[PDB]
Design a protein that fits this description.
about 10% strand, HAdV-F41, little secondary structure, about 90 residues, two-stranded antiparallel ribbon, icosahedral, 1 chains, virus, virion
């Protein structure tokens, strides 16, 4: 994959949730409930899309809309507060 460990002589590699702290996936602006507020304000509703097209629930954070409950490793590594995370 490319996910290696620094200090590889310590035993135990484990990428667990609560380790990728600053890497909560953003929440996928709902572009269909928007541009319907610009064609209803010219003749802006910025909202996430907390549901799959097939009713699957994008796990949106309860009190932190605009950030889904999935935590990616590439996030929380790149945009993740170095020196304190992945």
């Amino acid at each position: 994959l490319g996910i290696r460990k620094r200090l590889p002589f310590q035993e135990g590699f484990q990428i667990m949730y609560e380790d990728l702290e600053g890497g909560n996936i953003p929440a996928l602006l709902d572009v269909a409930k928007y541009e319907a507020s610009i064609q209803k304000a010219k003749e802006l509703v910025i909202e996430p899309v907390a549901k799959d097209s097939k009713n699957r629930s994008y796990n949106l954070l309860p009190n932190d809309q605009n950030n889904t409950a999935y935590r990616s490793w590439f996030l929380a590594y790149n945009y993740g507060d170095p020196k304190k995370g992945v």
